[PDB]
């Protein structure tokens, strides 16, 4: 369909964030303030894969990868990937799939023994088709 | 008591691997080796917080934070704690309510909106305590 796997770039900022509008509150920032996010994430080794159309350069996927440098396991590292997002339209189109193993692989290539992530009940069942097993549990506190 | 709350340093890192032997598979590392995992944490923007038994040095208690900032929610981080582990010996110390909250009032203070981490069963009752409550399912792949 015209869409290209990728990094993410500046002047994808607003189309992202409307993407992640479907994830969770997305309230409107300046192209500036975007920045300005997209350069904190970059510093703390965060990657963001996207899927665009080309033609258009609307975002319609969307997916993030953590490395964490461990001392354990001989200072192998874990791959965290989070907010997964895929544009409504494009759901059951395999974006999803794409992102997932694109940043399993990145995660592979930097000495990663394991990826995780954060899955809904809803989801469960996409990611273990994936070949993940639910292991632990999310705690979470609000501030 | 004679313990100490503190973030880690270079002197610290092969005592406070033993401890991490407690959590997980921790094979041995050199000094040099520990070393330039801490480099890469750092590097990460990973802050780690250690119980030490000052007159010794001896590191009995630990706990990391990953502050992410998100393009969501107006640019709100969200605190990342991993990595948990106190040594059995101060099973009864109350060092793990001590270093979470200490990693909770940092994520405040960097305007985290919430605090996440993955806990195994076991642990699951000493969070739930904390405030913490059952969200999300981890999902795990090997690599």
Same mark, same amino acid.
């Given at each position: 369909?015209?869409?290209?796997?990728?990094?993410?770039?500046?002047?994808?900022? *607003? *189309?992202?964030?409307?993407?992640? %509008?479907?994830?969770?509150?997305?309230? !409107?920032?300046? =192209?500036?303030?975007?920045?300005?996010?997209?350069?904190?994430?970059?510093?703390? %080794?965060?990657?963001?894969?996207?899927?665009?159309?080309?033609?258009?350069?609307?975002?319609?996927?969307?997916?993030?990868?953590?490395?964490?440098?461990?001392?354990?396991? =001989?200072?192998?590292?874990? %791959?965290h990937?989070?907010?997964?997002?895929?544009? !409504?339209?494009?759901? %059951?189109?395999?974006?999803?799939?794409?992102?997932?193993?694109?940043?399993?692989?990145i *995660?592979? *290539?930097? =000495?990663?023994?394991?990826?995780?992530?954060?899955?809904?009940?809803?989801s469960?069942?996409?990611?273990?088709?994936? =070949?993940?097993?639910?292991?632990?549990?999310?705690?979470?506190?609000?501030?």
């Open positions: 369909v015209d869409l290209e796997l990728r990094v993410l770039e500046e002047s994808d900022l *607003s *189309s992202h964030l409307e993407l992640l %509008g479907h994830l969770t509150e997305a309230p !409107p920032l300046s =192209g500036v303030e975007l920045a300005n996010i997209a350069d904190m994430r970059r510093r703390a %080794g965060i990657v963001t894969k996207v899927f665009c159309h080309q033609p258009t350069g609307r975002i319609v996927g969307s997916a993030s990868l953590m490395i964490q440098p461990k001392f354990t396991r =001989g200072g192998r590292a874990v %791959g990937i989070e907010d997964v997002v895929v544009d !409504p339209s494009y759901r %059951g189109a395999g974006l999803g799939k794409a992102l997932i193993m694109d940043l399993c692989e *995660s592979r *290539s930097k =000495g990663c023994y394991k990826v995780i992530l954060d899955s809904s009940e809803k469960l069942p996409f990611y273990e088709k994936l =070949g993940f097993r639910a292991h632990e549990r999310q705690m979470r506190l609000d501030l």
